[PDB]
Design a binder for these strands. Structure first.
Lengths: 126, 208, 60, 135, 99, 155
RNA sequence: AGCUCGUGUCGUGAGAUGUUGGGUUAAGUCCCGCAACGAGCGCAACCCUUGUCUCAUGUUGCCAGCACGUUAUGGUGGGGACUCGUGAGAGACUGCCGGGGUCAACUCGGAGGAAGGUGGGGAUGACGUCAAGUCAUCAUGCCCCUUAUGUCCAGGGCUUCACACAUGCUACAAUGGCCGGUACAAAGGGCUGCGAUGCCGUGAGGUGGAGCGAAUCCUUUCAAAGCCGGUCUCAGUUCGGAUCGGGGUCUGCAACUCGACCCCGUGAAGUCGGAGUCGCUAGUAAUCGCAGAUCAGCAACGCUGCGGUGAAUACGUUCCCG
């Protein structure tokens, strides 16, 4: 058994792999039925295309937290780490494109006495 | 308002809570009774130095511990004013009270006791000079402590003007959380109003 | 608060809506949290005094 | 490396620094390097390096000084002044810019040349070696 | 035949852990089966207060209250465990109830 | 920015065309924080250009921006309460930035009542050289060359 | 980012030196040289949170793999293979290399790595200054009423209006307006409280009640922006919502002055706003919804938080301010 976990700014995904055909399951939907974005499509294709072994794995994803782009990035990173695990020889490839660099960017706290984060109220000289 | 309370700053690492119990539905009644008993205990005894008062309130079990420098006027041989305390706590419906009275081994090493003593010394006739210098010297005689600062504010000396004076010896690192810093505030009454005395005592460091 | 106002607050109102907060320690009718029953000033002062079971400085 | 100002006349602080060096070298030999903060050990070693390249002979003085040999007194005004104030005899080289009235045991010569300085150092160390041999 | 959960709550981590350890030791001494003190979400109440009376609203201070809760599940209801349950001494800041 | 220049931001390669000009344009036209709608607007404009000119979008946009890329700018420097206009040459990066900013800012003025055809029409006009971006470019060069005298401050 | 002390040295002396100069740094942070050598309070660190992993760890949480479920779903048994809930620990330390360096701090580039140079943000605000604010949080000395300025009570005011200032929200629309479908967040709160199904309403809502003192139940499997399909085609607009009319719902003993919300109708100003001015340098502004405190109901567009989507330039100190 293989199971991998991905996280992206409050979105958490868990991916299971099968060596089956070139199709994906996202909580019961395919890659086009769910995440109907061409940009997200290329984003998720980027690991497999970089490793140049597309259409060789069937993934099953369980998703929580975040929105479209956050979960898309989380799935991308999770499947990238899963592929690195099953085939370590591709480790010096994704790092060349920086797909192993997890993104440590989140929502900055809204600070009291202000409007939001770094925004400030209007200042009047009189 | 620049320096925050060091005691309240250190409630998460160094200093613990002086009133520990648990409640979910009856928080209002508990806190009302707690402030009532605290005020009654503070008012009933004033000639002695009450350094600390801790309250315990669990289920049917309620008890309180009072720390004083001179327990002789606090626990009688027969318990007369102790019985007065018992009557007062029973009037306000404090149920069973296991009121144990404790003492302090180094009364000169407590911020509250030093503050109180320098307060009456400044109030009666003595200038802030001699009283607070003597308090600092008495604290620095004891070797366990390492630093002290004493501040006084108000109409010092009876003058008609605000005044504030601070004297410091040793190290008083407020900005260190793991610093065993004891803080005490007191007010000395007078015909000119009130004089505030604030004592910081830094006594070594503690590491778990 | 005037002692008469405090006693009238202690006196239970003759109508349901005629009741208000009347902070316990002092008697400041504004900004009285239902969790404590205290005014915000008194709550802050007592919490910084280390005499409340659970309260502490917030930071995150 | 450099003559510290007033380290001779002030003997308490040099003793404190010598104790600090002794204890720090003892801990370094013992091997305490990862039982503290990593950054703490980093500037600990930095303090080691800073207080070692100017501390080469003071580490092994112990029994106070009695004679001071001075090269380029015009660059060593403070050292000679401290020795004079403390009563320590001063044996110094005289240059044309130096005051002969200051040195108790003046030795004319050139202090701007390595060869003359090397020769003078060698002869004076031969003198002190003979003194120890005949001691 | 019957299993009992006990909810076990406190602000303080030290006292709650000590109570759990004592109860587990007592159960082991008595001879009954328990799953163990499984962790539960920690409730947090957050409040805001104004530092200064009479104006200067921008300066405030936040307060928290944290309650750590756990469950202890006991199987095989040994009668001696029930006999020795309520006599166990517990810390002041720790509250345990049965379910 | 007082101490030194901040490091330049990287540009993510455009997945559909491979050149970053299109993603720069879509990032600039982006407003209210929506990448998808701006992307579809730019892509619709580019495909209208495809069907109207019959040539490759990359090269036509390239020489269009080259023909609308400014070369010099005018800067204000004040002394004694009175200002002076000095001409300074521009790095190509800010030149392309200003050209694209002009295009996007003035693409809200064409009176055909839809943004995607607005972009397609102005892109085609700049490709033909009759667009208003050419007019702003000529005005900027007129300002730069006419006031070439006041440059002795050397900035 | 500054404020002091011990010893030493200088001056008859108050005093000075250290704390000056060059460089560097977020910094009195550090280096070099200098009669200074060192040490305290400040700074940094010990604290909270976010980003990775290891171990302990399975309920109310999850469901890989197995049986019962067939649509109502981990729902019912079971399980740690995965998040997760919560405890402990590892790890960012100029660690290594190369060029500039005074073989110095330091600066840039590279390697590994989740992060490269205080990773991101909170908490903490020194000595001092404004006779700054608060006798209306509380107490506090002096003066005042003391048969009253005390004091209970009914109605009315703090929302009055020809004006001016400040802070906000909604619009001047086609990057849009209206109609149906479609899928993913977080946090929080709940006892005379959250309150689901059915019953009848256009919608607030009237009937009554199952789950929960609460990882169990309710906030719809929790929203909007997003995407798809239909239409509107530039007008005071299928924009905009003000004022005004008729009829109601909820709470409250009591809704006119003076609560909120609902149905229907005419549909005012409003065309990107002069002199001038404001917030902002990475998950920031901008946009969108949700939650909480106070609250019976709310004037809330306010305040404190959460999450979604998310780019621009920074040449350089010449000028304006601290």
């Amino acid at each position: 058994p293989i199971q991998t976990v991905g996280r992206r700014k409050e979105a958490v995904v868990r991916v299971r792999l099968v060596p089956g055909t070139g199709q994906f399951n996202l909580d019961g939907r395919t890659l086009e039925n769910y995440f109907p974005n061409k940009v997200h499509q290329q984003l998720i294709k980027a690991p497999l295309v970089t490793v140049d072994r597309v259409d060789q794995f069937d993934i099953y994803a369980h998703l929580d937290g975040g929105g479209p782009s956050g979960q898309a990035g989380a799935l991308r990173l999770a499947i990238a780490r899963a592929l690195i695990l099953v085939q370590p020889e591709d480790r010096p490839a994704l790092k060349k494109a920086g797909f192993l660099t997890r993104d440590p960017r989140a929502i900055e706290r809204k600070k009291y006495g202000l409007k939001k984060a770094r925004k400030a109220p209007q200042y009047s000289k009189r | 308002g620049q320096k925050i309370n060091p005691h309240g700053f250190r409630l998460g690492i160094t200093t613990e809570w002086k009133s520990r119990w648990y409640a979910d539905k009856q928080y209002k009644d508990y806190v009302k009774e707690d402030v009532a008993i605290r005020k009654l205990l503070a008012t009933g005894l004033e000639r002695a130095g009450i350094a600390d008062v801790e309250i315990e309130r669990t289920r049917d079990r309620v008890r309180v511990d009072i720390h004083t420098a001179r327990p002789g006027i606090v626990i009688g041989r027969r318990g007369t004013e102790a019985d007065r305390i018992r009557a007062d706590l029973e009037k306000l419906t404090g149920k069973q009270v296991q009121l144990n009275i404790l003492e302090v081994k180094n009364p000169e090493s407590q911020a509250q006791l030093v503050a109180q003593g320098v307060a009456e010394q400044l109030s009666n006739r003595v200038a802030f000079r001699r009283a607070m210098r003597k308090a600092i010297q008495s604290a620095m005689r004891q070797p366990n402590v390492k630093g002290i600062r004493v501040q006084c504010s108000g109409r010092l000396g009876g003058a008609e003007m605000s005044r504030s004076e601070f004297y410091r010896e040793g190290r008083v690192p407020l900005h260190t959380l793991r610093a065993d810093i004891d803080y005490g505030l007191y007010e000395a009454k007078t015909t000119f109003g009130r004089i505030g005395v604030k004592v910081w005592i830094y006594k070594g460091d503690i590491v778990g | 608060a005037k002692k008469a106002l405090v006693h009238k607050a202690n006196k239970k109102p003759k109508f349901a809506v005629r009741a208000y907060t009347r902070c316990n320690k002092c008697g400041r009718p504004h900004s009285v949290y239902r969790k404590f029953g205290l005014c915000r000033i008194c709550l802050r002062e007592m919490a910084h005094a280390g005499e409340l079971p659970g309260v502490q400085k917030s930071s995150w | 490396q450099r003559w510290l100002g007033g380290m001779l006349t002030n003997f308490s602080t040099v003793h404190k620094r010598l104790q600090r060096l002794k204890e720090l070298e003892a801990m370094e030999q013992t091997g305490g390097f990862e039982g503290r903060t990593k950054k703490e050990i980093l500037m600990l070693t930095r303090e080691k390096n800073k207080l070692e390249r100017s501390l080469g002979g003071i580490r092994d003085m112990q029994k106070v000084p009695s004679a001071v040999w001075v090269v380029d007194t015009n660059k060593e005004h403070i050292a000679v002044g401290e020795a004079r104030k403390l009563g320590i005899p001063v044996i110094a080289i005289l240059d044309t810019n130096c005051d002969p009235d200051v040195v108790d045991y003046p030795i004319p010569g050139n202090d701007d040349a390595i060869r003359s300085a090397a020769l003078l150092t060698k002869v004076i160390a031969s003198a002190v070696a003979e003194g120890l041999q005949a001691r | 035949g019957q299993k009992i959960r006990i909810r076990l709550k406190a602000y303080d981590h030290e006292a709650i852990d000590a109570s759990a350890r004592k109860i587990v030791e007592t159960v082991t001494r008595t001879g009954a089966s328990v799953v163990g003190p499984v962790p539960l979400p920690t409730e947090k109440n957050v409040y805001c207060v104004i530092r200064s009376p009479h104006k200067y609203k921008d300066s405030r201070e936040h307060f928290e209250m944290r309650t750590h809760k756990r469950l202890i599940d006991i199987l095989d209801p040994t009668p001696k465990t029930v006999d020795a349950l309520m006599r166990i001494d517990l810390p002041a800041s720790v509250d345990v109830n049965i379910q | 920015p007082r101490k030194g220049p901040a490091p330049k931001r990287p540009l993510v390669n455009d997945p559909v065309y491979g050149s970053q000009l299109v993603t720069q344009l879509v990032n600039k036209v982006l407003l209210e924080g929506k990448k998808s709608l701006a992307e579809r607007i730019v892509y619709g404009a580019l495909e209208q250009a495809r069907e109207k000119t019959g040539t490759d979008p990359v090269v036509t946009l390239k020489r269009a921006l080259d023909n609308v890329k400014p070369a010099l700018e005018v800067r204000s420097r004040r002394v004694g309460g009175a200002t002076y206009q000095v001409p300074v040459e521009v790095r190509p990066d800010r030149s392309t930035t200003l050209a694209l900013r002009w295009l996007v800012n003035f693409s809200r003025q064409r009176r055909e009542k839809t943004m995607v055809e607005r972009l397609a029409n102005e892109i085609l006009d700049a490709s033909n050289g009759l667009g208003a971006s050419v007019k702003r470019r000529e005005d900027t060069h007129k300002m730069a060359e006419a006031n070439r005298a006041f440059a002795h401050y050397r900035w």
